[PDB]
Amino acid sequence: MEMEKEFEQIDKSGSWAAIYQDIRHEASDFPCRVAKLPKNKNRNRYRDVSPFDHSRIKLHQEDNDYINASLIKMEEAQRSYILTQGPLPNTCGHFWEMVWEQKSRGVVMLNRVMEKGSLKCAQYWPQKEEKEMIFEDTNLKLTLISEDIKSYYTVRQLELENLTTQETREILHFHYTTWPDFGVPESPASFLNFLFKVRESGSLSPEHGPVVVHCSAGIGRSGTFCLADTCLLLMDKRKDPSSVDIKKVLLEMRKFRMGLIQTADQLRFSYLAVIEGAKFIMGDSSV
């Protein structure tokens, strides 16, 4: 597994920070002019995290079509993802409008609402079945149908209703709840198990719109999730599995949204997940 001897060589040489900086130097730099217009200042959670103009998701509405969200389209892998920031108190209606318009089936959330004693995300879904949420600026109603709480993650089933037309869709919410406050998980086993739960749900499949992935800024943990998924897909599809190069897949994803993978230990963790997940897809079905 070329990547696995690349992994051991980089650990041995203690050069993860140098590998990561080289990725930062060669990453694309495209314009983000819409994100920087003054009328959009309260739609952005972080001043240094914006969507490129060429890949941004446009809301289907006159007035203001802006949301901080990017379409990441992986041609060879045949997979698309929408990466977005954690919604703001005033962008929750835009978030669900984007989900409606893009025909997404799943939302993947990789942060908690409060981390390090600060609010990383608005409470954008209902916590109780009997208290639904109405987003009047976008004319959508959201209802909790059920939820399954497990040790490392929670899965919710929600109903999203277009109050204009009274159509309804079922949305699956996949909430990874135990990413540590500092660093990365020591073992990728629980992250891979989470990834495969999302895959089994159908939410990642071409009969649906792209899955919506977010953490707080939509680049760190979010980038790790998409990078691992796409790498494992390429290894399944290809005549030569060990031809998959993580660093070139990461740079290709960074053509669509800036800053994906935010630290050198996130880079290292991404290798770990792909190496370990590759065991579980080269014929070794056992668990």
Ligand SMILES: C=C(C)[C@@H]1CC[C@@H](C)[C@@H]2CCC(C)=C[C@@H]21
């Ligand atoms: C996905 C994995 C590589 C691991 C295999 C071993 C288990 C302890 C762990 C938790 C239980 C499930 C179903 C698989 C996970």
Ligand SMILES: [Mg+2]
């Ligand atoms: Mg460059």
